[PDB]
Scaffold this active site. Structure first.
Site, mmCIF file in Angstrom:
data_model
loop_
_atom_site.group_PDB
_atom_site.id
_atom_site.type_symbol
_atom_site.label_atom_id
_atom_site.label_comp_id
_atom_site.label_asym_id
_atom_site.label_seq_id
_atom_site.Cartn_x
_atom_site.Cartn_y
_atom_site.Cartn_z
ATOM 1 N N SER A 179 0.762 -1.252 0.000
ATOM 2 C CA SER A 179 0.000 0.000 0.000
ATOM 3 C C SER A 179 0.795 1.306 0.000
ATOM 4 O O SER A 179 0.206 2.378 -0.173
ATOM 5 C CB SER A 179 -1.040 -0.002 1.116
ATOM 6 O OG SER A 179 -2.220 -0.637 0.673
ATOM 7 N N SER B 75 -6.454 3.166 3.655
ATOM 8 C CA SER B 75 -5.772 2.441 2.579
ATOM 9 C C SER B 75 -6.802 1.773 1.645
ATOM 10 O O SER B 75 -6.861 0.532 1.528
ATOM 11 C CB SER B 75 -4.797 1.425 3.193
ATOM 12 O OG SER B 75 -3.829 0.986 2.271
ATOM 13 N N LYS C 193 0.286 3.660 -2.961
ATOM 14 C CA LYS C 193 -0.709 4.736 -2.895
ATOM 15 C C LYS C 193 -0.076 6.107 -2.742
ATOM 16 O O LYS C 193 -0.667 7.101 -3.163
ATOM 17 C CB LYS C 193 -1.702 4.505 -1.757
ATOM 18 C CG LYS C 193 -2.806 3.528 -2.071
ATOM 19 C CD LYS C 193 -3.621 3.237 -0.825
ATOM 20 C CE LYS C 193 -4.659 2.158 -1.065
ATOM 21 N NZ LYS C 193 -4.097 0.764 -1.071
HETATM 22 B B1 LIG Z 1 -2.396 -1.984 1.369
HETATM 23 O O1 LIG Z 1 -1.291 -3.017 1.598
HETATM 24 O O2 LIG Z 1 -3.012 -1.677 2.737
HETATM 25 C C1 LIG Z 1 -3.505 -2.559 0.395
HETATM 26 C C2 LIG Z 1 -2.857 -3.200 -0.822
HETATM 27 N N1 LIG Z 1 -4.170 -3.632 1.080
HETATM 28 C C3 LIG Z 1 -5.363 -3.692 1.684
HETATM 29 O O3 LIG Z 1 -6.243 -2.832 1.707
HETATM 30 C C4 LIG Z 1 -4.990 -4.451 2.919
HETATM 31 C C5 LIG Z 1 -4.902 -5.825 2.729
HETATM 32 O O4 LIG Z 1 -5.046 -6.371 1.378
HETATM 33 C C6 LIG Z 1 -4.282 -7.468 0.861
HETATM 34 C C7 LIG Z 1 -4.572 -6.595 3.844
HETATM 35 C C8 LIG Z 1 -4.437 -5.994 5.104
HETATM 36 C C9 LIG Z 1 -4.605 -4.617 5.268
HETATM 37 C C10 LIG Z 1 -4.945 -3.819 4.171
HETATM 38 O O5 LIG Z 1 -5.088 -2.370 4.311
HETATM 39 C C11 LIG Z 1 -5.461 -1.748 5.544
#
Ligand SMILES: *[B]([O])([O])[C]([C])[N]C(=O)C1=C(O[C])[C]=[C][C]=C1O[C]
Ligand SMILES: [Co+2]
Length: 466
Positions: free
Chosen positions: A49, A298, A52
């Site tokens: 994430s 996120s 982003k």
């Molecule tokens: B980022 O890593 O937060 C985004 C790619 N991921 C998700 O929204 C996310 C997730 O997805 C695989 C697993 C755990 C948390 C989370 O975002 C809070």
């Protein structure tokens, strides 16, 4: 007093939770350019994430902080004395925050314009983006879950946080031995229900699973809910987000005195239509405000929609290919060296993404002196803040530490991928840092990330709130 910092960070990185892992750790003084710490700075790693950060900066560059998104309702002509239209179109143009209540207000507008009977069919038009719902290398098994919701120009967002392309499923126990009650939320009468779940004895083990089997629009509930269990709620995606939006709008219209005689489905406003009569519209908040729920929690859907919005702005193509080149070009014009960036999506969900810690730090510096620097900064999670809309993914981290209330950082989270990157604004200077970890095999190295960030606040001359 730098040597003492480097030794402390060196020792934090000696964690057994980092055995086998590769970690890029870069700390730079944004005020006076000084690189304070560097370890594998140019190493290409999965950002999760943290991708982003790049997506959001490009969105502000391309779209602007003042950018808003439109949705409208169109018929081929205005209603007459009879209050009659034939077919009716709900046209979405990439609003990532479009609520069920927004559908109701537009349905009321359609009524107030004079429409009483939609004689034809109601169409859900999402042709502003392409119909490519998922990124290539995303995982089919992720599909039932909110973070893997299908991407559309027309999508309904759920709750304060604007989780798109999902419905809220509520599972409630009955009497022991009776089926559990499943409530499919907004997707009632849209998605199919396969309820195999039963109510178990008071005190029995909760074994309830909610799934959407791959390639279906069926919500399958299996397992047991005990009789004394609290209701279980889970966000679950639906197939064809725009068609649910169409489904929910038909209801909104009916609830607002407008009868719909025909069917609901997907379709774009015909090229035939000489002068579409717009009978209702909605405008979102501006992107500056949309950034908050996007970056704090996120939001993957927001990211990908913003990507395709960029593709529309730069190229008139609501497309990942166009949008990603759009992101890369925008980052370049911002002054960022994009040599180590591989862009496969906006959210970071894709494992085909690569960044380096230096690239992240580079972006942090360039974004810091951008015109949109404050709205960018305001969307970043703040360490250890109790309000979800302030703390976000960092709400229950670094509480009661020198880092509480000061460190503004973005998280990245996946299997064997963890990241923390942002700023440490002390009276001395505003520090920038990127911490990206790949290939650990136990828990996410959060304690390592927290420890570094806390030690960075203490370097920058902060004290733990007491
Ligand atoms: B980022 O890593 O937060 C985004 C790619 N991921 C998700 O929204 C996310 C997730 O997805 C695989 C697993 C755990 C948390 C989370 O975002 C809070
Ligand atoms: Co319904």
């Amino acid at each position: 007093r730098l040597t003492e910092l480097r030794e402390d960070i060196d020792a934090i990185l000696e964690d057994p939770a980092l055995e086998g892992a590769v970690s890029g750790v870069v700390v730079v003084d944004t005020a006076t350019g000084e690189e304070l710490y560097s370890r594998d700075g140019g190493e290409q790693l999965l950002p999760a994430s943290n991708m982003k950060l790049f997506t959001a900066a490009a969105a502000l560059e391309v779209l602007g902080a003042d950018h808003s998104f439109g949705t409208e309702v169109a018929a081929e002509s205005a209603p007459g004395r009879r209050g009659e239209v034939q077919d009716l179109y709900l046209v979405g143009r990439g609003d990532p925050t479009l609520s069920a209540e927004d559908l109701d207000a537009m349905a009321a507008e359609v009524a107030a314009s004079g429409v009483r009977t939609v004689r034809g069919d109601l169409y859900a038009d999402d042709t502003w983006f392409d119909s490519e719902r998922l990124v290539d290398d995303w995982w089919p098994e992720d599909e039932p879950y909110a973070y893997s919701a299908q991407i559309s120009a027309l999508t309904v967002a759920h709750g304060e946080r604007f989780d798109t392309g999902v419905t809220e499923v509520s599972v409630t126990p009955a009497a022991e031995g009776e089926p559990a009650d499943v409530d499919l939320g907004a997707a009632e009468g849209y998605a199919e229900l396969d309820n195999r779940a039963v109510t178990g004895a008071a005190g029995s083990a909760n074994t309830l699973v909610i799934d959407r089997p791959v390639g279906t629009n069926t919500i399958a509930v299996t397992g047991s809910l005990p009789a004394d269990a609290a209701p279980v709620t889970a966000l679950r995606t639906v197939d064809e987000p725009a068609a649910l939006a169409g489904h929910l709008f038909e209801e909104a219209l009916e609830s607002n005195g407008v009868t719909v005689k025909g069917d609901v489905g997907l379709g774009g406003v015909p090229a035939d239509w000489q002068d579409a009569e717009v009978l209702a519209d909605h405008t979102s908040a501006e992107l500056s405000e949309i950034l908050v729920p996007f970056m704090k929690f996120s939001n993957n859907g927001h990211a990908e929609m913003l990507v395709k919005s960029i593709g529309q702005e730069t190229a008139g193509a609501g497309t990942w290919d166009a949008g990603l080149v759009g992101v890369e070009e925008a980052l370049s014009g911002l002054g960022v060296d994009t040599a180590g960036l591989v862009l496969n999506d906006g959210s970071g969900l894709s494992r085909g993404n690569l960044v380096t810690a230096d690239t992240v730090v580079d972006l942090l510096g360039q974004a810091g002196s951008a015109p949109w620097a404050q709205t960018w900064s305001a969307s970043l999670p703040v360490a250890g803040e109790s309000d979800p809309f302030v703390g976000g993914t960092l709400a229950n981290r670094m509480r009661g530490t020198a880092a509480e209330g000061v460190v503004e950082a973005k998280t990245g989270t996946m299997s064997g991928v963890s990241a923390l990157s942002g700023y440490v604004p002390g009276p001395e200077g505003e520090l920038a840092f990127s911490i990206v970890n790949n290939g650990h095999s136990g828990p996410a190295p959060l304690a390592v990330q927290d420890a570094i960030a806390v030690r960075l606040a203490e370097y920058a001359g902060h004290q733990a709130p007491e």
